[PDB]
Each structure stands twice: as structure tokens, then as C-alpha cells.
């Protein structure tokens, strides 16, 4: 029921679904109920998965890093992240990337990373 890009794109900043059980917008907004409708007027929030991966890697020398979202009481419960593996460590609440400085040369060697590194 949708020709325009608002009716096909999963989000303005991402064409594709980001979970296996996610219904593609093209099939979700199809059928009789979407016939005489403005599609740009429909709610289409930006995909959070694309936005969090623009966040640069917060480098640290310490092995363990605390993350609470940065709002103090306005964030998430404080958790502690281990950066000892040679990879980008990510907060399981807010998705923020963290990496140890010991792994900077190997991470810079990597062809493509999950996070910009800069």
C-alpha cells in the first residue's frame, strides 16, 4: 500500500530491519487500512542502532570502566565494563563504546570497526 520512501524505508536513517522478528515497514503498512493515507505524516523515528554506532570510542587506560549513562541519577544503573579483550567493549545499557589503549594499534589495524575509533 506504499510507494513513497516513508512507506518502504524502515527508518529515515536505515532502510533495513535491525531484528529478525521485526516486520518490514513495506509489509506492515500494507493492506486496506493504509489506502487513503499520508505516509510522511506517519510516525517514523530514527533507528537507534544507526545512531549509537556514530559514537566514537571512549579510550581509557584503566581495565575497568564505570558507565551510568552520564545523567547521574537521570541515566541507568551503574555497571562496570571490562576492556581486557582486544575489541571495543560496549555498555549493555546505553551502548556506549569503550576500549583500552593497549589495543589501539590492533584496533587501528582492523579493516572496519563497529565504532568509528575517532
Amino acid at each position: 500500500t506504499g510507494r513513497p520512501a516513508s512507506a518502504v524505508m524502515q527508518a529515515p536513517n536505515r532502510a533495513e530491519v535491525w531484528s529478525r522478528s521485526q516486520r518490514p515497514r513495506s509489509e506492515a503498512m500494507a493492506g486496506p487500512r493504509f489506502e487513503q493515507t499520508d505516509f510522511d505524516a506517519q510516525p517514523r523515528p530514527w533507528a537507534a542502532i544507526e545512531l549509537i554506532h556514530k559514537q566514537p570510542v571512549r579510550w581509557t587506560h584503566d581495565r575497568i570502566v564505570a558507565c551510568d549513562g552520564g545523567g547521574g541519577p537521570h541515566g541507568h544503573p551503574k555497571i562496570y565494563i571490562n576492556t581486557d579483550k582486544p575489541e571495543i567493549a560496549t555498555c549493555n545499557y546505553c551502548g556506549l563504546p569503550f576500549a583500552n589503549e593497549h589495543h589501539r594499534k590492533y584496533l587501528e589495524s582492523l579493516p572496519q570497526t563497529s565504532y568509528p575509533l575517532n
Binding site: 522478528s21 521485526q22 505524516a41
Partner: protein, 134 residues
Amino acid sequence: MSYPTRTLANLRKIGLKEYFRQLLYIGDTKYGELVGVDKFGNKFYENKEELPLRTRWVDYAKHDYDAAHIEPMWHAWISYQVDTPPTREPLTQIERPWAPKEHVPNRSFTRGAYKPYNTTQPKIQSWEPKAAPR
């Protein structure tokens, strides 16, 4: 309920054209200082010598004025939920590239009305029949 001295004074401060226009939408003779303008073009005013809860008011940009036309942060200000107008509100300055750029009014009774739908895939998948050849 304006009273003579109030209405006569506001008339002098605003002029008869403005007076009659104000009488065409709000039905009162109000005058105050311009606090600011929102994204949709609504103008917001304050006067602390008015009656309680009448010290803040909006002049709507659109003839068919609707209460949902008010920009979010201004909605808090006019409803006395905050005292700092959005013109001085730091939380209005955080850059959110995902934030809606044009104002979002209520879209009911139009063809932009929100249509709900299932956001998930079917729970069960049937076999795709493959007749084996003889």
C-alpha cells in the same frame, strides 16, 4: 470579564484594529509583553498584573487555532509547569538530529492520522510445499 478601566487602558496600548482582532479570537482585551515565538508561529505573552492563571497566554499563528499547535517546551511554560520560558531554557538547546524538524500537531480527522500496525513477524511459518519429482 474585563471592567471599563482595564479595557479602556488596553485599547489605548493596542489600538482599535488590534482590539477588534483580539475580540475575534480570544474574546477579551489583553495586553502584555512578548515572551517569545514558537516554531509554528504562535506568540506568547506575559503580564503579572492579570488575574491568577491569566498571566500567560498565546496568540495562535493560525485562524483555525487548535491547542495542539503549541510547541512542546512552550506547552510547559503556558501551563505553568515551568517558569523559565524556552527562550532561556538550556534543555531546548541540546542538538538531537533525530528530533522532528517541523512541528507535529494532532493529525486526527485528517489523512495524516496515525495508523497502528503489528511491528513483529508472524509467530509461525508454514511449510513451503516442494513436490518431489517422480
